[PDB]
Each structure stands twice: as C-alpha cells, then as structure tokens.
Design an enzyme around this catalytic site. Structure first.
Site, PDB file in Angstrom:
ATOM      1  CE  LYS A 143     -31.103  64.890 -47.842  1.00 23.95           C
ATOM      2  NZ  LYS A 143     -31.431  66.285 -48.247  1.00 23.95           N
TER       3      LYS A 143
ATOM      4  CG  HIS B  29     -35.308  68.712 -55.574  1.00 23.36           C
ATOM      5  ND1 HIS B  29     -35.064  67.534 -54.900  1.00 23.36           N
ATOM      6  CD2 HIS B  29     -35.158  68.431 -56.893  1.00 23.36           C
ATOM      7  CE1 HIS B  29     -34.771  66.583 -55.770  1.00 23.36           C
ATOM      8  NE2 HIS B  29     -34.822  67.102 -56.988  1.00 23.36           N
ATOM      9  CG  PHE B  30     -28.615  68.685 -55.062  1.00 24.58           C
ATOM     10  CD1 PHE B  30     -28.269  67.386 -55.370  1.00 24.58           C
ATOM     11  CD2 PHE B  30     -27.735  69.706 -55.405  1.00 24.58           C
ATOM     12  CE1 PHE B  30     -27.055  67.084 -56.016  1.00 24.58           C
ATOM     13  CE2 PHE B  30     -26.506  69.416 -56.058  1.00 24.58           C
ATOM     14  CZ  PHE B  30     -26.170  68.102 -56.361  1.00 24.58           C
ATOM     15  CG  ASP B  31     -33.134  65.818 -59.965  1.00 22.07           C
ATOM     16  OD1 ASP B  31     -34.130  65.492 -59.276  1.00 22.07           O
ATOM     17  OD2 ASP B  31     -32.861  65.306 -61.068  1.00 22.07           O
TER      18      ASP B  31
ATOM     19  CG  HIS C 187      -7.001  67.894 -26.003  1.00 23.11           C
ATOM     20  ND1 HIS C 187      -7.004  69.254 -26.260  1.00 23.11           N
ATOM     21  CD2 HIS C 187      -7.354  67.759 -24.701  1.00 23.11           C
ATOM     22  CE1 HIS C 187      -7.344  69.908 -25.165  1.00 23.11           C
ATOM     23  NE2 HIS C 187      -7.563  69.027 -24.203  1.00 23.11           N
TER      24      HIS C 187
HETATM   25  N1  LIG Z   1      -3.197  75.988 -26.517  1.00 20.02           N
HETATM   26  C1  LIG Z   1      -4.129  75.526 -25.674  1.00 20.02           C
HETATM   27  C2  LIG Z   1      -4.299  76.131 -24.390  1.00 20.02           C
HETATM   28  C3  LIG Z   1      -5.266  75.646 -23.600  1.00 20.02           C
HETATM   29  N2  LIG Z   1      -6.063  74.613 -24.018  1.00 20.02           N
HETATM   30  C4  LIG Z   1      -7.158  74.105 -23.181  1.00 20.02           C
HETATM   31  C5  LIG Z   1      -7.006  72.715 -22.573  1.00 20.02           C
HETATM   32  C6  LIG Z   1      -7.544  72.886 -21.144  1.00 20.02           C
HETATM   33  O1  LIG Z   1      -8.597  71.932 -21.097  1.00 20.02           O
HETATM   34  P1  LIG Z   1      -8.298  70.423 -20.664  1.00 20.02           P
HETATM   35  O2  LIG Z   1      -7.271  69.822 -21.545  1.00 20.02           O
HETATM   36  O3  LIG Z   1      -9.632  69.784 -20.521  1.00 20.02           O
HETATM   37  O4  LIG Z   1      -7.597  70.524 -19.248  1.00 20.02           O
HETATM   38  C7  LIG Z   1      -8.349  70.947 -18.100  1.00 20.02           C
HETATM   39  C8  LIG Z   1      -8.550  69.782 -17.162  1.00 20.02           C
HETATM   40  O5  LIG Z   1      -7.266  69.168 -16.959  1.00 20.02           O
HETATM   41  C9  LIG Z   1      -7.042  68.955 -15.593  1.00 20.02           C
HETATM   42  N3  LIG Z   1      -5.762  69.561 -15.251  1.00 20.02           N
HETATM   43  C10 LIG Z   1      -5.328  70.867 -15.276  1.00 20.02           C
HETATM   44  N4  LIG Z   1      -4.043  70.998 -15.025  1.00 20.02           N
HETATM   45  C11 LIG Z   1      -3.615  69.696 -14.786  1.00 20.02           C
HETATM   46  C12 LIG Z   1      -2.358  69.143 -14.477  1.00 20.02           C
HETATM   47  N5  LIG Z   1      -1.239  69.843 -14.370  1.00 20.02           N
HETATM   48  N6  LIG Z   1      -2.286  67.811 -14.294  1.00 20.02           N
HETATM   49  C13 LIG Z   1      -3.398  67.084 -14.429  1.00 20.02           C
HETATM   50  N7  LIG Z   1      -4.631  67.477 -14.730  1.00 20.02           N
HETATM   51  C14 LIG Z   1      -4.670  68.812 -14.895  1.00 20.02           C
HETATM   52  C15 LIG Z   1      -8.291  69.340 -14.813  1.00 20.02           C
HETATM   53  C16 LIG Z   1      -9.056  70.213 -15.799  1.00 20.02           C
HETATM   54  O6  LIG Z   1     -10.427  69.855 -15.720  1.00 20.02           O
HETATM   55  C17 LIG Z   1      -8.165  74.288 -21.129  1.00 20.02           C
HETATM   56  C18 LIG Z   1      -8.011  75.050 -19.836  1.00 20.02           C
HETATM   57  O7  LIG Z   1      -6.623  75.064 -19.430  1.00 20.02           O
HETATM   58  O8  LIG Z   1      -7.465  75.011 -22.157  1.00 20.02           O
HETATM   59  C19 LIG Z   1      -5.862  74.023 -25.282  1.00 20.02           C
HETATM   60  O9  LIG Z   1      -6.592  73.076 -25.635  1.00 20.02           O
HETATM   61  N8  LIG Z   1      -4.890  74.501 -26.081  1.00 20.02           N
HETATM   62  N1  LIG Z   2     -26.563  63.151 -55.337  1.00 14.78           N
HETATM   63  C1  LIG Z   2     -27.602  63.462 -54.555  1.00 14.78           C
HETATM   64  C2  LIG Z   2     -28.767  62.647 -54.562  1.00 14.78           C
HETATM   65  C3  LIG Z   2     -29.760  62.980 -53.738  1.00 14.78           C
HETATM   66  N2  LIG Z   2     -29.647  64.059 -52.910  1.00 14.78           N
HETATM   67  C4  LIG Z   2     -30.682  64.371 -51.920  1.00 14.78           C
HETATM   68  C5  LIG Z   2     -31.437  65.689 -52.063  1.00 14.78           C
HETATM   69  C6  LIG Z   2     -32.899  65.283 -51.849  1.00 14.78           C
HETATM   70  O1  LIG Z   2     -33.257  66.110 -50.765  1.00 14.78           O
HETATM   71  P1  LIG Z   2     -33.975  67.501 -51.027  1.00 14.78           P
HETATM   72  O2  LIG Z   2     -33.021  68.330 -51.791  1.00 14.78           O
HETATM   73  O3  LIG Z   2     -34.522  67.986 -49.746  1.00 14.78           O
HETATM   74  O4  LIG Z   2     -35.192  67.183 -51.987  1.00 14.78           O
HETATM   75  C7  LIG Z   2     -36.421  66.677 -51.435  1.00 14.78           C
HETATM   76  C8  LIG Z   2     -37.454  67.776 -51.396  1.00 14.78           C
HETATM   77  O5  LIG Z   2     -37.459  68.362 -52.698  1.00 14.78           O
HETATM   78  C9  LIG Z   2     -38.771  68.592 -53.120  1.00 14.78           C
HETATM   79  N3  LIG Z   2     -38.847  68.182 -54.514  1.00 14.78           N
HETATM   80  C10 LIG Z   2     -38.489  67.004 -55.110  1.00 14.78           C
HETATM   81  N4  LIG Z   2     -38.487  67.069 -56.421  1.00 14.78           N
HETATM   82  C11 LIG Z   2     -38.910  68.358 -56.697  1.00 14.78           C
HETATM   83  C12 LIG Z   2     -39.077  69.074 -57.896  1.00 14.78           C
HETATM   84  N5  LIG Z   2     -38.742  68.600 -59.095  1.00 14.78           N
HETATM   85  N6  LIG Z   2     -39.568  70.329 -57.818  1.00 14.78           N
HETATM   86  C13 LIG Z   2     -39.824  70.843 -56.607  1.00 14.78           C
HETATM   87  N7  LIG Z   2     -39.656  70.288 -55.409  1.00 14.78           N
HETATM   88  C14 LIG Z   2     -39.194  69.034 -55.529  1.00 14.78           C
HETATM   89  C15 LIG Z   2     -39.757  68.077 -52.077  1.00 14.78           C
HETATM   90  C16 LIG Z   2     -38.869  67.273 -51.137  1.00 14.78           C
HETATM   91  O6  LIG Z   2     -39.191  67.676 -49.829  1.00 14.78           O
HETATM   92  C17 LIG Z   2     -32.832  63.859 -51.302  1.00 14.78           C
HETATM   93  C18 LIG Z   2     -33.951  62.953 -51.738  1.00 14.78           C
HETATM   94  O7  LIG Z   2     -33.992  62.900 -53.180  1.00 14.78           O
HETATM   95  O8  LIG Z   2     -31.606  63.320 -51.826  1.00 14.78           O
HETATM   96  C19 LIG Z   2     -28.518  64.872 -52.956  1.00 14.78           C
HETATM   97  O9  LIG Z   2     -28.479  65.882 -52.236  1.00 14.78           O
HETATM   98  N8  LIG Z   2     -27.505  64.542 -53.776  1.00 14.78           N
END
Ligand SMILES: Nc1ccn([C@H]2C[C@H](OP(=O)(O)OC[C@H]3O[C@@H](n4cnc5c(N)ncnc54)C[C@@H]3O)[C@@H](CO)O2)c(=O)n1
Ligand SMILES: Nc1ccn([C@H]2C[C@H](OP(=O)(O)OC[C@H]3O[C@@H](n4cnc5c(N)ncnc54)C[C@@H]3O)[C@@H](CO)O2)c(=O)n1
Lengths: 124, 124
Positions: free
Chosen positions: B41, B119-121, B12
């Site tokens: 990456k 590919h993103f350059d 939470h």
């Molecule tokens: N708006 C909402 C409504 C619901 N919820 C969620 C939270 C609950 O999970 P969690 O906080 O893990 O609580 C469940 C765990 O807490 C324990 N538990 C339940 N009632 C309790 C109590 N009165 N005092 C202490 N522990 C309690 C055991 C159980 O495994 C779930 C089920 O009621 O729903 C939410 O996130 N937002």
């Molecule tokens: N600001 C930035 C700077 C970098 N990057 C990322 C994207 C690149 O991943 P990707 O898009 O998968 O590219 C890699 C793949 O692309 C291919 N590839 C590279 N150059 C290419 C080209 N000119 N033409 C075709 N395929 C090419 C093969 C390789 O598996 C990575 C490495 O340079 O960095 C980014 O997202 N933003």
C-alpha cells in the site's frame, strides 16, 4: 468478508501506541524477526547499542552462564535494551509480549573466531 | 543453514530504534495490519487516538473529499498521527516505509447507519 468500517479500523486505528511510545514493539518485532513461527519464543531481549559495542562484550568480564557453561561475558556498562516476555494470556498463534524498556548490563555467550555473541544469556 | 552469530543478530540486535523511537514503526505495522500482502500500500495514516474520538469526527465540519465526494468530515482538534509512505527502494515483496509523526486535523469519509469512518482522506 470485512466491512468498510472494520477495514478503516484495521488500516487506520492504533489507539494507545505510537512510534514514540510503542508498547506493541515486542509484538511487532518478535513477529518480524521470526521468533513466533511454530511456537512463541518465550523471552527475548533486543539491544539498542551499536553492534560493535555488543561484539565488544566478548572482551569484558568473563562470567558463568545461567546453565553453568563458562563461555559468557558481562558488559562493563549498562545498555539500552528492551525486554520482550510473553504475557500470561499469550496463546500461539497469537503470541503476546510485554514490552519493557530498561538500562542494564547484559551477559552473552561468545563463540567462533573472532569471539562474537552467539547467545543472549541474561540482563542484570 | 543460518549461523549462530547471524541468528544472534536477527534475534537481539536493533541499534538505532527502541519502543520510544520506532523508526521502523510503519514497516512493522503495515505488514501486521495486512497492507503489504500482494503489493505495498503506497501511503497510509495511523491514528493514535481513541476510536470514540475518531468516530466523533463524523459529527464535525463537513467538507469535500479530495476526489470530489462530499461525505467527508474534518476534525476540529488535531490528532496524533503517523504518516506511512513507501520509500525510494521500496519494491514488493520487500516493502519499506518512512515513518513521520505529526499532529494535524484529520479528514475522513463517513458512511453507513449510523455514520462512522470508512475511509481516511487526508490530514491538514
Ligand atoms: N533476559 C533474557 C533471558 C533470556 N533470553 C533468551 C535468549 C535465549 O535465546 P537465544 O539467545 O536464541 O539463545 C539460545 C540458543 O543459544 C545457544 N546457546 C545456549 N547457551 C549457550 C552457550 N553458553 N554458548 C553458546 N551457545 C549457547 C543454543 C540455543 O539455541 C532464550 C533461552 O535461553 O532466552 C533473553 O533474550 N533475555
Ligand atoms: N495521508 C494519507 C493519504 C492517503 N491515505 C490512504 C488511505 C486510503 O485508503 P483507505 O482509507 O482504505 O481508502 C480507500 C477505500 O475508501 C473508500 N472510499 C474512498 N473514498 C470514499 C468516500 N469519500 N466515501 C466512502 N468510501 C470512500 C473505498 C476504498 O476502498 C488510501 C488510498 O487513498 O490512501 C492515508 O491513509 N493517508
């Protein structure tokens, strides 16, 4: 085997998204934060406030958790959060999520000593 | 095992980032698009424009590639791009990247029949 053209698309093309508008945010983060292993976690909220601001919720309005447990706390202020919810089409292993950014109050369950969030309950 | 408080942070917490300011964009995307399997990456550019708009560069200003090849083309208009570059501490298998958003003309290498980007350059 993959064509040079197909390779350029995989490495260089991200049409429709960017770091300032990442609708793929949830797709990426759910994968990253390991919530797509074995099955897709259905819902998950990511909080964008400070960890200290979130640990502090454990010191605010005590509330009842959705299931009824009583160790939940509601934040005083709304917080910048992102809701991740599986889409209707989501099928493991290709877990898909809808990314929604909102500002809402959060409710977490806190445990241990000191009391820190150990579960996210809801966003209100 | 992983603690409940740790699990909560892994699931939470994301202070300092959001779908509208994804400084981790590159870290996430380089992994997702398979550019960190084996080694990191070094540099990679992501283009946030339509595939049609990038293919069309193959019909624009013919130029020489960085290495001297002559099948490169430069875009007449600038493009929304994101530069991903390894950081100082980046070392496999923990690849780290600096995300930098800019708008520049792109230069790509085009090949095949019909001629398309292979590919993103560079950018300029
Ligand atoms: N708006 C909402 C409504 C619901 N919820 C969620 C939270 C609950 O999970 P969690 O906080 O893990 O609580 C469940 C765990 O807490 C324990 N538990 C339940 N009632 C309790 C109590 N009165 N005092 C202490 N522990 C309690 C055991 C159980 O495994 C779930 C089920 O009621 O729903 C939410 O996130 N937002
Ligand atoms: N600001 C930035 C700077 C970098 N990057 C990322 C994207 C690149 O991943 P990707 O898009 O998968 O590219 C890699 C793949 O692309 C291919 N590839 C590279 N150059 C290419 C080209 N000119 N033409 C075709 N395929 C090419 C093969 C390789 O598996 C990575 C490495 O340079 O960095 C980014 O997202 N933003």
């Amino acid at each position: 085997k993959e064509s040079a053209a197909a390779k350029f698309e995989r490495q260089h093309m991200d049409s429709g998204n960017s770091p300032s508008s990442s609708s793929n945010y949830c797709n990426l983060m759910m994968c990253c934060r390991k919530m797509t292993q074995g099955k897709c976690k259905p819902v998950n909220t990511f909080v964008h406030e400070s960890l200290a601001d979130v640990k502090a919720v454990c010191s605010q309005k005590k509330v009842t958790c959705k299931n009824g447990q009583t160790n939940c706390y509601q934040s005083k202020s709304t917080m910048r959060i992102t809701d991740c919810r599986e889409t209707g089409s989501s099928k493991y292993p290709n877990c898909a999520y809808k990314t929604t950014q909102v500002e809402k109050h959060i409710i977490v369950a806190c445990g241990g000593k000191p009391s820190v969030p150990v579960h996210f309950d809801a966003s209100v």
